[PDB]
Amino acid sequence: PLVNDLRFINGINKFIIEDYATHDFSIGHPLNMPSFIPTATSPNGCTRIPSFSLGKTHWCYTHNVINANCKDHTSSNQYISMGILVQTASGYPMFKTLKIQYLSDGLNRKSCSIATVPDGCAMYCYVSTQLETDDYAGSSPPTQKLTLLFYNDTVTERTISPTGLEGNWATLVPGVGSGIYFENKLIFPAYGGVLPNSTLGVKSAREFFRPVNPYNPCSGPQQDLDQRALRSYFPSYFSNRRVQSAFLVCAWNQILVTNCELVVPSNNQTLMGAEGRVLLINNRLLYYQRSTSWWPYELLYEISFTFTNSGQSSVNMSWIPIYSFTRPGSGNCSGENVCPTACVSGVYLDPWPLTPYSHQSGINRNFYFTGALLNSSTTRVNPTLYVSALNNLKVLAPYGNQGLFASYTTTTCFQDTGDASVYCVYIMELASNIVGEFQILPVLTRLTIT
Amino acid sequence: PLVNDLRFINGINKFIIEDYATHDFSIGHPLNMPSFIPTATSPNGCTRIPSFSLGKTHWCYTHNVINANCKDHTSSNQYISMGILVQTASGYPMFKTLKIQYLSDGLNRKSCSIATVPDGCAMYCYVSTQLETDDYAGSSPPTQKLTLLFYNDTVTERTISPTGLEGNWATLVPGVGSGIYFENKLIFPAYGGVLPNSTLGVKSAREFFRPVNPYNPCSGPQQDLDQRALRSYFPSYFSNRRVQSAFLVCAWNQILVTNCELVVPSNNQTLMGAEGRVLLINNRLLYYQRSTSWWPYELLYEISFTFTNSGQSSVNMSWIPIYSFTRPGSGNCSGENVCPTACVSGVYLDPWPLTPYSHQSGINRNFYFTGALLNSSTTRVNPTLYVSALNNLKVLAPYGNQGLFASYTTTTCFQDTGDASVYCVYIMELASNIVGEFQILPVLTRLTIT
Ligand SMILES: CC(=O)N[C@H]1[C@H]([C@H](O)[C@H](O)CO)O[C@@](O[C@H]2[C@@H](O)[C@@H](CO)O[C@@H](O[C@H]3[C@H](O)[C@@H](O)[C@@H](O)O[C@@H]3CO)[C@@H]2O)(C(=O)O)C[C@@H]1O
Ligand SMILES: CC(=O)N[C@H]1[C@H]([C@H](O)[C@H](O)CO)O[C@@](O[C@H]2[C@@H](O)[C@@H](CO)O[C@@H](O[C@H]3[C@H](O)[C@@H](O)[C@@H](O)O[C@@H]3CO)[C@@H]2O)(C(=O)O)C[C@@H]1O
Ligand SMILES: *[C@@H]1O[C@H](CO)[C@@H](O)[C@H](O)[C@H]1NC(C)=O
Ligand SMILES: *[C@@H]1O[C@H](CO)[C@@H](O)[C@H](O)[C@H]1NC(C)=O
Ligand SMILES: *[C@@H]1O[C@H](CO)[C@@H](O)[C@H](O)[C@H]1NC(C)=O
Ligand SMILES: *[C@@H]1O[C@H](CO)[C@@H](O)[C@H](O)[C@H]1NC(C)=O
Ligand SMILES: *[C@@H]1O[C@H](CO)[C@@H](O)[C@H](O)[C@H]1NC(C)=O
Ligand SMILES: *[C@@H]1O[C@H](CO)[C@@H](O)[C@H](O)[C@H]1NC(C)=O
Ligand SMILES: *[C@@H]1O[C@H](CO)[C@@H](O)[C@H](O)[C@H]1NC(C)=O
Ligand SMILES: *[C@@H]1O[C@H](CO)[C@@H](O)[C@H](O)[C@H]1NC(C)=O
Ligand SMILES: *[C@@H]1O[C@H](CO)[C@@H](O)[C@H](O)[C@H]1NC(C)=O
Ligand SMILES: *[C@@H]1O[C@H](CO)[C@@H](O)[C@H](O)[C@H]1NC(C)=O
C-alpha cells in the first residue's frame, strides 16, 4: 500500500511544540540512508530546483535535470517520485521510493511545484520557450501545465488557463515550493508579472508592504521609504511589470475539467512576487515567500481563503514578524541591505515552523522555526542547519566545511509518535566534486528540544 | 510490466563485435540522467561494494550501506533495486527503478552478489560476525544466505549449506560481482579459504597456475617460480588456508528447498581465490577474477560446466591471455610486480568483452574489452574509462581530474538495436566531497567503433 509507517501518520503536518514556552535546541548529526534523491550521472550535467511534499500517507518529490550546463537551457527533463516513510533497524526512518516518473519528452517544463494528492502527486509547471526576462518583457504568459501522477502508473497532463490570467499577466510560473491538497482544494504557489495597465494592474497600483525591523531600522522619512517600497514591485530587470505572488487553486473534484483559478493577494499584505511554498499545519495554512526583493529576512505568512460561492475567491495574509538571519544577495540587494529598493535577488530557503504563531488563545512570541540557511550576505555558500526564534538564532549546525557552495534549501519536519522523536529533513542543493552542479541532498536529523 | 524497452532486449548479453577484425574506439562523454544508484545522506557514512546485472528483460542492483565509517563494523544494511531500460528524449536510455528493497534488520550481510532472475533478483550474501581474517583463521564457514526478491513485492530468504562446504572450508563468501541465471541454473561467484588437511585440501594441494607475460616475463627458473606460485595460494594473512575461488550453483527449479552446490575449479587453471563475476554472453560463460594475488593484469576466463547426473559437477576454465593494463596494489604486490609472491591485494575492476575470444572457427586475436581502471600502480586513484586489446590499451578517457580517489568498478555494455548505438555503463565507487566515502556512480557512455 502507498502509506507511511503508522508511527508517522499522526506526526505529520503538526505543530510539534504547542508549549508557547521557551525552548533550547540541539540539531543532531546526519542519519545515513540511501538517498531518495538521484544525482546527476555526469560531471557537468545540471540537476536543480527541488520540490518536496510530505503528506499524511506518502511523500512526493520532483527536480529538474539537464543534459547540459546549468546556464545552458534548450529543453530539460523532470524527475518525479513518490513514496513512503519506513522505519529501519538503524533506529530512524528512511524515504522509500515506490514510484518513479521521468518526464523526458522534449518539453521544457521548469519552475515546477509538486503536491501530495490522494493516491499520488500533482505537479504544476510552465513550459519555457525563452529567457525569464523575455517572458516578462512580452505580453503573453507561457503555457501552464498541470500533471497528475498516480500509484496505478496513470499519468495525465493538462494545459490550464486559470480564471484571471488572460489579459492581466505578462507571465506566470509556479513558485517551486510544494503546494497542498486540503478540503477538495489543490493549491500551488505561483508568481509572475502583472501588466500594469490591465484591470488587475490598475486595481492594485496603490498597494505596497514595508516590513520594519525595529532592531535595525531604515533611515529616512516614512513617505520616502513607502514610495521606494511601492516602486520596488516594478523592477526594470522584469520590464517594470508589477511582480506579483499568486495562488493557483483548483477544485480537486473537477481536476480533469477545471481550468482552475488564480487568487491574488493584496500587496498591502505581501512583498514583491517570488518563489514560495504553501504549508498546511494542523489545519492552518501558511505561505513561505522567497526574499527576492529588498527585505532580507525570512518571510512566512499565516493565510486564509474565502472561496466566494465558487465565484472569484480572495486570500488574506498576515506577516509573521521575523527578523533573525538574512539571506545572501547581490549588489544593493545583499543580506546587509534592510531598505526599500528594486531588487531581483536572494535565494529559496524555506522554514518549517515548529510552533503555532497565532492561536485561539493569543499570539505566541516564543515562535520557533527550523531550516537551512546560507552563511553569507553575498554568496550562495556555507549551508547551515538552524533553529531560529523571531529575533535570534537558537542553534546552528554547519553542513560541510567553510567554502562549500550551496543554493536552494527546503525543510520538512515530522514526529515519530511511537518514540516521540522529532525528525527534520533538510533538502539542499550542494556543490559536488564529481557530479553535475548541485547534488540535491536530503539530510535527515533528529531534533532535540528542551 | 518488468521489461526493458524492446530496442535493447536483443542487444543485451551479446558480443557486439563479431568481426574478428581490428577496430578503433572512441569513448563518448557521460550521458546525464537521474542516477539509479542512491548516495549516502551523511558526510562520513559508508556506501560500498556494488553488484549489477543487466538481463534481457530487466536489471538488478545491490550495494552495502553503513551509518558509520567504512572501517568500523557493527552491522550494515543492503540496498537492493530492480528496474528496466527506458529510452529518453535526450537520445539515450535511462535506468528506471521499479522496485526498492532496503534490507535493514540488524543482520550484517556482506560481500553480496546479485543476479537477474525471472520476475526479480536473487542475492547471495554471508552474514559477517567478525573480521575477515578471523573468518579465515577459524574452522567454521560463516552463515550463507540466499535471498529472492520479486516484482510482486515478495521477498524470501534462506540459509544454505551447499554440497561440499561442510568440513572442507574455513570460510566462503560471495564474489561481489554479479551471478547469472541460465538453463535452470543460478550461478554465483564465490571464494574463501580451504582447510588444507581436508579432502578438498589434499586433493588440490599440487595445483597452481603461473601466468607469464611474454612482453614482461618474470626472470628466474621454472621450478622455483612454480613453487613460489604454488605457495602464493596460502597467504599467512588468511592463516595459510588455501584461498580458493568457487561457484555456487543452484537449481532454480528447486530454489526454495535445494541446498545448492559448490563447484570448485582446478587451481591449475586459475589463480588464488578472489572476488569475481560470472558473465553469460551469447550462450557462453565467462568468469572475471579480481587480481588479489601477485599477477597484476586483468583476469578473464572462458568457462564451462559439466553437471554429472545431478551428482558432483565439475568446471573447466581457460584463461584468456590478457596483459595490458595493471591494477594498483601495495608493497611487492603492486601493479609493477610480475613475479610469484604471496599477495592479498589489488582491487575489483571487471571487464566487459566486446568480442568473442574463442569461437567455432578459431581464436580471435582481435579480442577487445572495455571497463574502468585506476591509473596508478600503488594507489586507488584516477578512474579511467578504457577500451583494451589483448596487449595494449586502445583508448582512454579519465573521469574527473588527477587525484580523484576511486575503488571498485563494474562495467556492462549493451546495444540499441534500433539505431545500433552501443552503450557502456561504468559503475564506479568514487570519492565524494559531500557524501560518505564512495558515491557509487553509474556513468553511461556511447561507444564509437570503427
Ligand atoms: C523561471 C525562472 O527562471 N526561475 C529561476 C529563479 C527566478 O529567476 C527567480 O525566482 C527570480 O524570479 O531564480 C533562479 O535562477 C537564478 C540563477 O540562475 C542565478 C545564477 O547565479 O542567476 C539569476 O539571474 C540573475 C543573474 O544571474 C544576474 O546576472 C543578474 O542579472 O540578476 C539576475 C536575477 O537575480 C537567476 O534568477 C535561482 O537559482 O535563483 C532559479 C530559477 O531557475
Ligand atoms: C569479505 C571481505 O572482507 N571483503 C573485502 C575485500 C576482501 O578483503 C578482499 O577481496 C580479500 O579477500 O576487500 C575489500 O576490503 C579491503 C579494504 O577494506 C582495504 C582498505 O584500504 O583493506 C583491505 O585489507 C588490507 C588491509 O587494509 C591492509 O592493512 C593489509 O593488511 O592488507 C589487507 C588486504 O589487502 C580490505 O581487504 C576492498 O575494498 O578491497 C572489500 C571487502 O570489504
Ligand atoms: C501596457 O501593457 C502592455 C502589454 O499589453 C505592455 O506591452 C506595455 O508596455 C504596458 N505599458 C506600461 C506603461 O506598463
Ligand atoms: C488510477 O487512479 C486514479 C485515482 O483517482 C483513478 O481516477 C484512475 O481511474 C485510475 N486509473 C486506472 C487505470 O486504474
Ligand atoms: C492598500 O493600502 C493603500 C494605502 O497604503 C490604500 O490606498 C489601499 O486602499 C489599500 N488597498 C487594500 C486592498 O487594502
Ligand atoms: C487579514 O490579515 C490582516 C493582517 O495583515 C488582519 O489584520 C485582518 O484582520 C485579516 N482580515 C480578516 C478579514 O480576517
Ligand atoms: C557564519 O560563520 C561564522 C564563522 O565562519 C560564524 O561565526 C557565524 O556565527 C556564522 N553565522 C551563521 C548565521 O551561521
Ligand atoms: C586442519 O583442519 C581442521 C579442521 O578439520 C582445522 O581446524 C585446522 O585449522 C586445519 N589445520 C591447518 C594447519 O590448516
Ligand atoms: C511472487 O512471484 C513468485 C514467482 O515469480 C511466486 O512464486 C510467488 O508466489 C509470488 N508471490 C505472491 C504473493 O504471489
Ligand atoms: C594439476 O597439475 C599438477 C602438476 O602441476 C598435476 O599433478 C595434476 O595432475 C593436475 N591436476 C589437474 C586437475 O589438472
Ligand atoms: C579446459 O580448458 C583447457 C584450457 O585450460 C582446455 O585445454 C581444454 O579444452 C578444456 N578441457 C576440456 C575437457 O574440454
Ligand atoms: C595515467 O596518467 C598519465 C597522465 O598523468 C597519462 O599520461 C597516462 O596515459 C595514464 N595512464 C592510463 C592507463 O590511463
A345 contacts A290 by C-beta, under 8 angstroms: no
Q: How many domains does chain A have?
A: 1
- Does residue B388 line the site of ligand 12, with CB under 6 A? no
Distance CA B281, CA B302 (A): 11
Which own/partner contact pairs does A208-214 have at CB distance under 8 Å and 24+ positions apart? A208/A232, A208/A233, A208/A267, A208/A268, A209/A267, A209/A268, A209/A269, A209/A270, A209/A271, A209/A319, A210/A340, A211/A271, A211/A295, A211/A297, A211/A319, A211/A321, A211/A323, A213/A297, A213/A323, A213/A338
Number of CB atoms found within 10 A of residue B78's CB: 24
Longest C-alpha distance within chain B, in Å? Answer: 61
| Strand pairing category for A46-54 and B352-353 | unpaired
Chain A residues whose CB is inside 8 A of the B97 CB are 97, 100
Burial code (b: 16+ CB inside 10 Å, e: under 16) for A290-307 equals bbbbbbbbbbbbbbebeb
Q: A400–B443: do the CB atoms touch at under 8 Å?
A: no
For a mutational test of ligand 3's pocket, the pick from A134, A135, A139, i.e. the residue with the most ligand atoms closer than 8 A to its C-beta, is: A139
Cα A175-A446-B440 angle, rounded to 5 deg: 75
Q: Which three cell numbers stand for residue A169?
A: 499577466
Burial code (b: 16+ CB inside 10 Å, e: under 16) for B94-121 equals bbbbbbbbbbbeebbbbbbbbbbbeebb
Helices (H), A23-169: 132-137
Distance CA A435, CA B39 (A): 11
Does B28 reach chain A within 8 Å, measured CB to CB? Answer: no
Distance CA B60, CA A38 (A): 17
Chain A residues whose CB is inside 8 A of the B32 CB are 40-42, 45-46, 65-68, 436
Q: A32–B436: do the CB atoms touch at under 8 Å?
A: yes
Q: How far is CA A25 from the centre of its chain?
A: 24
Q: Which residues line ligand 3 (CB under 6 A)?
A: A 139, 195-197
- Does residue B137 line the site of ligand 8, with CB under 6 A? no
Residue B336 phi, psi dihedral angles, 5° rounding: -90, -20
Distance CA B125, CA A69 (A): 41
Longest C-alpha distance within chain A, in Å? Answer: 62
Q: A32–B39: do the CB atoms touch at under 8 Å?
A: no
Distance CA B134, CA B171 (A): 10
- Torsion-angle region of A204 (φ positive above 0: left; ψ -120 to 50: alpha; else: beta): alpha
Distance CA A211, CA A214 (A): 10
For residue B12, give the DSSP letter.
B
Nearest to A85 by CA among A174, A6, A180: A6
Distance CA B436, CA B47 (A): 7
Q: Which three cell numbers stand for residue B244?
A: 580458493
Cα B32-A65-A428 angle, rounded to 5 deg: 115
Q: How far is CA B167 from the centre of its chain?
A: 27
Q: Which three cell numbers stand for residue B144?
A: 550463507
Number of CB atoms found within 10 A of residue A168's CB: 23
Atom of ligand 3 nearest to the CA of A170: 4
Atom of ligand 8 nearest to the CA of B197: 1
Which H or E element spans position B133? Answer: helix B132-137
- Does residue A316 line the site of ligand 6, with CB under 6 A? yes
Declared resolution, Å: 2.2
Cα A414-A415-A417 angle, rounded to 5 deg: 150
Helix (H, G, I), strand (E, B) or coil at B439: strand
Q: Which ligand is nearest the CA of B149, by number?
A: 9
Chain A residues whose CB is inside 8 A of the B432 CB are 432-434, 439
Q: Looking at residue A20, which CATH number applies to its domain? A: 2.120.10.10
Backbone Cα Rg of chain A: 21
A291 contacts A322 by C-beta, under 8 angstroms: no
Does B69 reach chain A within 8 Å, measured CB to CB? Answer: no
Helix (H, G, I), strand (E, B) or coil at B197: coil
CA atoms within 13 A on the CB side of B72: 6
Q: Which three cell numbers stand for residue A330?
A: 547581490
Chain B: residue whose CA lies nearest to A105: B89
B303 contacts B319 by C-beta, under 8 angstroms: no
B239 contacts B201 by C-beta, under 8 angstroms: no
Distance CA B286, CA B317 (A): 8
Distance CA B285, CA B188 (A): 12
Residue for cell digits 526576462? A133
Q: Which three cell numbers stand for residue B173?
A: 563468501
Q: Which residues are bridge partners to B442 per DSSP?
A: B427
Q: Which three cell numbers stand for residue A144?
A: 501552464
Distance CA B59, CA B53 (A): 6
A370 contacts A349 by C-beta, under 8 angstroms: no
Distance CA A279, CA A43 (A): 35
Number of CB atoms found within 10 A of residue A376's CB: 16
DSSP line for A156-177: EEEEE--BT-TTTEEEEEE-BS
Burial code (b: 16+ CB inside 10 Å, e: under 16) for A140-159 equals ebbebbbbbbbeeeebeeee
Q: Which ligand is nearest the CA of B319, by number?
A: 11
Helix (H, G, I), strand (E, B) or coil at A262: strand
A299 contacts A290 by C-beta, under 8 angstroms: yes
Among B5, B81, B90, B98, which would you mutate to test the A interface (most chain A Cβ atoms within 10 Å of its Cβ)?
Answer: B90
For residue A38, give the DSSP letter.
P
DSSP E strands in A283-438: the ranges are 284-289, 299-306, 314-319, 352-353, 369-374, 383-388, 393-398, 406-415, 422-430
Chain B: residue whose CA lies nearest to A107: B89
Does B276 reach chain A within 8 Å, measured CB to CB? Answer: no
Among A435, A440, A441, A445, which would you mutate to test the B interface (most chain B Cβ atoms within 10 Å of its Cβ)?
Answer: A435
Burial code (b: 16+ CB inside 10 Å, e: under 16) for B217-244 equals ebeeeeeebeebbbebbbbeebbbbbbb
List the determination method.
Answer: X-ray
Distance CA B319, CA B289 (A): 10
Q: Which of residues 370-409 of A touch B (CB under 8 A)?
A: 399-400, 404
Q: Which three cell numbers stand for residue A60?
A: 512526493
Q: Which three cell numbers stand for residue B360?
A: 567455432
Q: B43–A30: do the CB atoms touch at under 8 Å?
A: yes
Nearest to B445 by CA among A41, A78, A65: A41
| Strand pairing category for B25-27 and B439-449 | antiparallel
Task: Kindly report the nearest CA distance between residue B343 and chain A, in angstroms.
Answer: 32
Contact partners, residue B257, CB within 8 Å, separation at least 6: none
Q: Which of residues 88-147 of A touch B (CB under 8 A)?
A: 88-90, 94, 96-98, 100, 102, 104-106
DSSP E strands in A41-76: the ranges are 46-54, 59-66
Q: Which three cell numbers stand for residue A222?
A: 516614512
- Does residue A206 line the site of ligand 5, with CB under 6 A? yes
B346 to A422, B293, B377: CA distances (angstroms): 45, 7, 9
Count each helix (H run) and each strand (E run) in chain A, helices first.
4, 25
Residue type at position B396 = L
Q: How far is CA B11 from the centre of its chain?
A: 21
Alpha-carbon dihedral sign for residues A87, A90, A95, A97? negative
Helix (H, G, I), strand (E, B) or coil at B136: helix
Contact partners, residue A309, CB within 8 Å, separation at least 6: none
Chain A residues whose CB is inside 8 A of the B94 CB are 102, 104
Distance CA B161, CA B146 (A): 10
Residue for cell digits 552474514? B127
Residue A343 phi, psi dihedral angles, 5° rounding: -135, 140
Backbone Cα Rg of chain B: 21
Does A358 reach chain B within 8 Å, measured CB to CB? Answer: no
Burial code (b: 16+ CB inside 10 Å, e: under 16) for B152-187 equals eeebeeeeeebebbeebbbbbbbbbbbbbbbeebbb
CA atoms within 13 A on the CB side of B376: 18
Q: Which ligand is nearest the CA of B317, by number?
A: 11
- Torsion-angle region of A20 (φ positive above 0: left; ψ -120 to 50: alpha; else: beta): left
A117 contacts A181 by C-beta, under 8 angstroms: yes
Q: Which ligand is nearest the CA of A203, by number?
A: 5
Residue for cell digits 535535470? A65
Residue of minimum CA distance from atom 11 in ligand 5? A207
B32 contacts A43 by C-beta, under 8 angstroms: no
For residue A92, give the DSSP letter.
S
Q: B31–A42: do the CB atoms touch at under 8 Å?
A: yes
Contact partners, residue B165, CB within 8 Å, separation at least 6: B141, B144, B172, B262
Print the SS3 string covering B356-389.
CCECCCCECCCCCEEEEEECCCCCCECEEEEEEC
Q: What strands, in cross-sheet order, belong to the sheet with A439-449?
A: A25-27, A439-449, A422-430, A406-415
Helix (H, G, I), strand (E, B) or coil at A271: coil
Residue B116 phi, psi dihedral angles, 5° rounding: -80, 125
B282 to A153, B85, B236, B360: CA distances (angstroms): 34, 20, 40, 13
Residue of minimum CA distance from atom 9 in ligand 9? B154
Print the SS3 string covering B145-183.
EEEEEECCCCEEEEEECCECCCCCEEEEEECECCCEEEC
Nearest to A415 by CA among A4, A12, A5: A12
Nearest to A187 by CA among A81, A304, A300: A304
Helix (H, G, I), strand (E, B) or coil at A61: strand
A25 contacts A16 by C-beta, under 8 angstroms: no
Among B31, B41, B95, which would you mutate to test the A interface (most chain A Cβ atoms within 10 Å of its Cβ)?
Answer: B41
Q: A31–B41: do the CB atoms touch at under 8 Å?
A: yes
B224 contacts B208 by C-beta, under 8 angstroms: no
For residue A153, give the DSSP letter.
S
Distance CA B33, CA A67 (A): 7
Helix (H, G, I), strand (E, B) or coil at B30: coil
A323 contacts A216 by C-beta, under 8 angstroms: yes
Instruction: Give the residue numbers spanning the domain of A11.
Output: 1-450
% helix, strand, coil for chain A, step of 5: 5, 40, 50
Distance CA B154, CA B152 (A): 6
Q: Which three cell numbers stand for residue B191?
A: 571464494
Distance CA B60, CA B113 (A): 10
How close are the terminal C-alpha atoms of chain B, in Å? 37
Nearest to B189 by CA among B145, B235, B124: B124
Q: What is the distance in A from the centroid of ligand 10 to the CA of A95?
A: 55
- Select from A68, A100, A443 the Cβ nearest to the Cβ of B96: A100
Q: Which residues are bridge partners to A249 per DSSP?
A: A187, A261
